[PDB]
């Protein structure tokens, strides 16, 4: 045997339907906020290149500088990628442990059955 509730159940839905509407929306903002942190952060590491003024020994030594960096960075990127990978495992691993701890009827078919032709 059990009892009744405090506020209109239809309302509770509308808030729930709204807490999400916002969060979903507040996510889009955290997202548009990232795309912006990407540009500004790339403008710091990946400074813009102004060749217009460089000479030959200037242009070459830089081409050498760059060629040299490409490898250093592709490695940094591997290490993180490395870890983000270990995590997919990790996350999918714990996701498993939790998982381990944790007929058919339509409405109209029934109504059809009870009332007849309605």
């Amino acid at each position: 045997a059990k009892k009744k509730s405090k506020i209109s159940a239809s309302r509770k839905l509308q808030l729930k339907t709204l807490l999400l509407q916002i969060a979903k929306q507040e996510l889009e903002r955290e997202a548009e906020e990232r795309r912006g942190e990407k540009g500004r952060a790339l403008s710091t590491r990946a400074q813009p290149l102004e060749l217009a003024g460089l000479g030959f020994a200037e242009l070459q030594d830089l081409a050498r500088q760059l060629h040299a960096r490409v490898d250093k960075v592709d490695e940094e990127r591997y290490d993180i990628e490395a870890k983000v990978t270990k995590n997919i495992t990790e996350i999918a691993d714990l996701t498993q442990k939790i998982f381990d701890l944790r007929v058919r009827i339509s409405a109209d078919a029934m109504m059809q059955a009870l009332l007849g032709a309605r």
């Binding site: 952060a41 460089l54 993180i80 995590n87 996350i91």
Partner: protein, 69 residues
């Protein structure tokens, strides 16, 4: 040691082999290219850097959930 000379030399070689024949105008062309790829990478890193962060968080809420059940 000797094995270490090779890495140093063959490293320099790679630089020579790609840039040395390039001309004033072809370098600008190369520097652009090279920079462009350096950037592309630094960006691939970012999204990952971000990925890794949300991951720190995804996991944590997992350890939370677990201890609780």
């Amino acid at each position: 040691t000797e094995r270490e000379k090779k890495k140093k030399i063959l490293a320099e070689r790679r630089k020579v082999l790609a840039i040395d024949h390039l001309n004033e105008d072809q370098l600008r062309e190369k520097a652009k290219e090279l920079w462009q790829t350096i950037y592309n990478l630094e960006a691939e890193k970012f999204d990952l850097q971000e990925k890794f962060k949300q991951q720190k968080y995804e996991i944590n809420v997992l350890r939370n959930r677990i201890n609780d059940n």
